[PDB]
Scaffold this motif. Structure first.
Motif, mmCIF file in Angstrom:
data_model
loop_
_atom_site.group_PDB
_atom_site.id
_atom_site.type_symbol
_atom_site.label_atom_id
_atom_site.label_comp_id
_atom_site.label_asym_id
_atom_site.label_seq_id
_atom_site.Cartn_x
_atom_site.Cartn_y
_atom_site.Cartn_z
ATOM 1 N N UNK B 76 0.833 -1.198 0.000
ATOM 2 C CA UNK B 76 0.000 0.000 0.000
ATOM 3 C C UNK B 76 0.864 1.242 0.000
ATOM 4 N N UNK B 77 1.875 1.262 0.863
ATOM 5 C CA UNK B 77 2.744 2.425 0.939
ATOM 6 C C UNK B 77 3.520 2.597 -0.347
ATOM 7 N N UNK B 78 4.307 1.583 -0.721
ATOM 8 C CA UNK B 78 5.160 1.716 -1.893
ATOM 9 C C UNK B 78 4.374 2.250 -3.070
ATOM 10 N N UNK B 79 3.094 1.905 -3.151
ATOM 11 C CA UNK B 79 2.281 2.402 -4.243
ATOM 12 C C UNK B 79 1.828 3.832 -3.987
ATOM 13 N N UNK B 80 1.087 4.055 -2.904
ATOM 14 C CA UNK B 80 0.645 5.404 -2.582
ATOM 15 C C UNK B 80 1.777 6.399 -2.807
ATOM 16 N N UNK B 81 3.019 5.935 -2.642
ATOM 17 C CA UNK B 81 4.165 6.753 -3.001
ATOM 18 C C UNK B 81 4.349 6.871 -4.503
ATOM 19 N N UNK B 82 4.291 5.741 -5.225
ATOM 20 C CA UNK B 82 4.351 5.836 -6.682
ATOM 21 C C UNK B 82 3.195 6.673 -7.204
ATOM 22 N N UNK B 83 2.077 6.682 -6.485
ATOM 23 C CA UNK B 83 0.940 7.494 -6.859
ATOM 24 C C UNK B 83 0.957 8.876 -6.232
ATOM 25 N N UNK B 84 2.036 9.633 -6.461
ATOM 26 C CA UNK B 84 2.082 11.014 -5.989
ATOM 27 C C UNK B 84 1.035 11.878 -6.689
ATOM 28 N N UNK B 85 0.725 11.573 -7.951
ATOM 29 C CA UNK B 85 -0.363 12.229 -8.650
ATOM 30 C C UNK B 85 -1.651 11.431 -8.576
ATOM 31 N N UNK B 86 -1.928 10.939 -7.388
ATOM 32 C CA UNK B 86 -3.099 10.114 -7.160
ATOM 33 C C UNK B 86 -4.338 10.723 -6.396
ATOM 34 N N UNK B 87 -4.917 11.785 -6.933
ATOM 35 C CA UNK B 87 -6.134 12.386 -6.366
ATOM 36 C C UNK B 87 -5.990 13.325 -5.176
ATOM 37 N N UNK B 88 -4.925 13.106 -4.421
ATOM 38 C CA UNK B 88 -4.560 14.106 -3.473
ATOM 39 C C UNK B 88 -4.114 14.974 -4.541
ATOM 40 N N UNK B 89 -3.814 16.199 -4.178
ATOM 41 C CA UNK B 89 -4.002 16.845 -2.859
ATOM 42 C C UNK B 89 -4.306 16.169 -1.512
ATOM 43 N N UNK B 92 -4.137 11.518 -1.058
ATOM 44 C CA UNK B 92 -2.772 11.079 -0.720
ATOM 45 C C UNK B 92 -2.502 11.287 0.775
ATOM 46 N N UNK B 93 -2.887 12.424 1.326
ATOM 47 C CA UNK B 93 -2.666 12.675 2.723
ATOM 48 C C UNK B 93 -3.536 11.773 3.540
ATOM 49 N N UNK B 94 -4.774 11.642 3.147
ATOM 50 C CA UNK B 94 -5.691 10.757 3.848
ATOM 51 C C UNK B 94 -5.201 9.318 3.806
ATOM 52 N N UNK B 95 -4.680 8.886 2.660
ATOM 53 C CA UNK B 95 -4.230 7.508 2.537
ATOM 54 C C UNK B 95 -2.939 7.292 3.317
#
Lengths: 20, 140
Positions: B76-89, B92-95
């Motif tokens: 989950x982390x390694x991805x949420x990191x690869x997904x820097x352009x992932x709907x956050x604003x 990303x912070x929430x995740x």
């Protein structure tokens, strides 16, 4: 990498996502 | 006396490192307060060495701590990191927050398991004096 600190003097273990 | 605690720990891709902090008044130790870093495998080394010591037949030996399982969170982390352009604003912070909560849960469980093992040993009349336990606490 994630760093864990056990809570000290009142409060509250914490985690930080390590960065450089 | 002989007091042991784990005040911090680090989860990397392929290992978990624990700070093992000892305070002792016993003359066998090189100093009265010191800290080392150990991985989970070092605890298992210690446990298995004790179990295999024939002079300890009949003694209660505390169970080895459980293997930390950060596989879920780490990814989950390694991805949420690869997904820097992932709907956050915000997302990303929430995740990041929800995932930190997931890491904190695993840390709390595994630090507790590792620490209780060492504390049980520290209070054991025989095992507290074991040379392999001393190596485990002092080697740096």
């Amino acid at each position: 990498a994630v760093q864990f600190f056990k809570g000290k003097n009142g409060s509250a273990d914490q985690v930080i996502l390590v960065t450089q | 006396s002989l007091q042991i605690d784990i005040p911090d720990a680090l989860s990397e891709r392929d290992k978990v490192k624990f700070t093992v902090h000892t305070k002792t008044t016993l003359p066998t130790f090189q100093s009265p307060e010191f800290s080392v870093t150990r991985q989970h495998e070092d605890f298992v080394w210690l446990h298995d060495t004790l179990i295999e010591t024939t002079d300890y037949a009949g003694l209660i030996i505390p169970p080895a701590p459980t293997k930390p399982d950060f596989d879920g969170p780490r990814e989950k982390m390694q991805k949420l990191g690869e997904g820097e352009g992932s709907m956050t604003k915000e997302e990303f912070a929430k995740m990041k927050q929800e995932l930190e909560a997931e890491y904190l849960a695993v840390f709390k469980k595994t630090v507790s398991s590792h620490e209780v093992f060492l504390q049980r040993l520290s209070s054991h009349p025989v095992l507290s004096k074991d040379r392999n336990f001393h190596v485990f606490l002092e080697y740096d």
